[PDB]
Swiss-Prot record:
This is Nuclear receptor ROR-gamma. The gene is RORC. The chain holds residues 267 to 507 of 518 of the full protein. Isoform 1 is widely expressed in many tissues, including liver and adipose, and highly expressed in skeletal muscle. Isoform 2 is primarily expressed in immature thymocytes. Residues 3-241 form the NR LBD domain. A motif (AF-2) lies at residues 235-240. It is linked to Immunodeficiency 42: An autosomal recessive primary immunodeficiency characterized by increased susceptibility to concomitant candidiasis and mycobacteriosis. Candidiasis is characterized by persistent and/or recurrent infections of the skin, nails and mucous membranes caused by organisms of the genus Candida. Mycobacteriosis is characterized by infections caused by moderately virulent mycobacterial species, such as Bacillus Calmette-Guerin (BCG) vaccine, environmental non-tuberculous mycobacteria, and by the more virulent Mycobacterium tuberculosis. The AF-2 (activation function-2) motif is required for recruiting coregulators containing LXXLL motifs such as NCOA1 and NCOA2.
Length: 241
């Protein structure tokens, strides 16, 4: 009956509709691991082919997060400048959080192109430190057994942050943020999951991880430009031109 219970339902629905793979499918595929031969095949690929593959997967992941944001109550009513400020700053942070679902803490593997593989699958990219950081981050969230609704509500808060520099209608973003904060806290209380609050990553950790990741993608894009499937001209302009 409350606006808050409806907000939880709407955020979770927006999330279910914008999540590429179902949790059940990711969990059943846990036993489907790349063989020693398949790993070698990925390791032998050119860094530039691995870059193209990864850039396609990441672009697609970002577009689903943009669709997720568009479905958040009041996001569409924000001015274009603020929608772009929030997505530029937060869309990749949401992508990085969403990765924990495809991460298996038991063998330190991630679901990539149909099977589970370790960080050694990405050797040709020559990004070992960055990839270890992404794996470590996914591990910290996966150890919490972060539920589907916890991911939906937490990633809505990653996006709707009134502290992002450059916002023009801060008060409008704050209104949306307070309601989502209440929705998250109300949901954790009901499910007896408030204990994860002290275990979540410090905000600065996600920001720094995302800045390092985006900086690396920008270096690859400068050296070897990809043909990007662009759906959002104002957002594309901010990241690529
Ligand atoms: C959604 C999109 C469009 O369809 O118009 C525009 C922006 C994208 C994006 N890319 N991106 C990347 O990091 C990225 C990606 Cl996802 C792939 C290749 C290159 C890059 C980049 F920007 F670094 F050059 C973002 C980071 C934060 C917010 C972002 F929105 C992005 C992807 C496509």
């Amino acid at each position: 009956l409350t606006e808050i219970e409806h907000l939880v339902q709407s955020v979770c629905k927006s999330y279910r509709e914008t999540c590429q793979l179902r949790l059940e499918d990711l969990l059943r595929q846990r036993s489907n691991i790349f063989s020693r031969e398949e790993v070698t095949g990925y390791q032998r690929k050119s860094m530039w082919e691995m870059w193209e593959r990864c850039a396609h997967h990441l672009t697609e992941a970002i577009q689903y997060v943009v669709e997720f944001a568009k479905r958040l109550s009041g996001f569409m009513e924000l001015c274009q400048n603020d929608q772009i400020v929030l997505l530029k700053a937060g869309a990749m942070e949401v992508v990085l959080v969403r990765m924990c679902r495809a991460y298996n803490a038991d063998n330190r593997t991630v679901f990539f192109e149909g099977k589970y593989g370790g960080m050694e699958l990405f050797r040709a990219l020559g990004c070992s430190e960055l990839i270890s950081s992404i794996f470590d981050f996914s591990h910290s969230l996966s150890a919490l057994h972060f539920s589907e609704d916890e991911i939906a509500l937490y990633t809505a808060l990653v996006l709707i942050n009134a502290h992002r520099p450059g916002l023009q209608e801060k008060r409008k973003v704050e209104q949306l943020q307070y309601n989502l904060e209440l929705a998250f806290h109300h949901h954790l209380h009901k499910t007896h999951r408030q204990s994860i609050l002290a275990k979540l990553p410090p905000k600065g950790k996600l920001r720094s991880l995302c800045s390092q990741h985006v900086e690396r993608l920008q270096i690859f894009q400068h050296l070897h430009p990809i043909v990007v499937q662009a759906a959002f001209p104002p957002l594309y302009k901010e990241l690529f031109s």
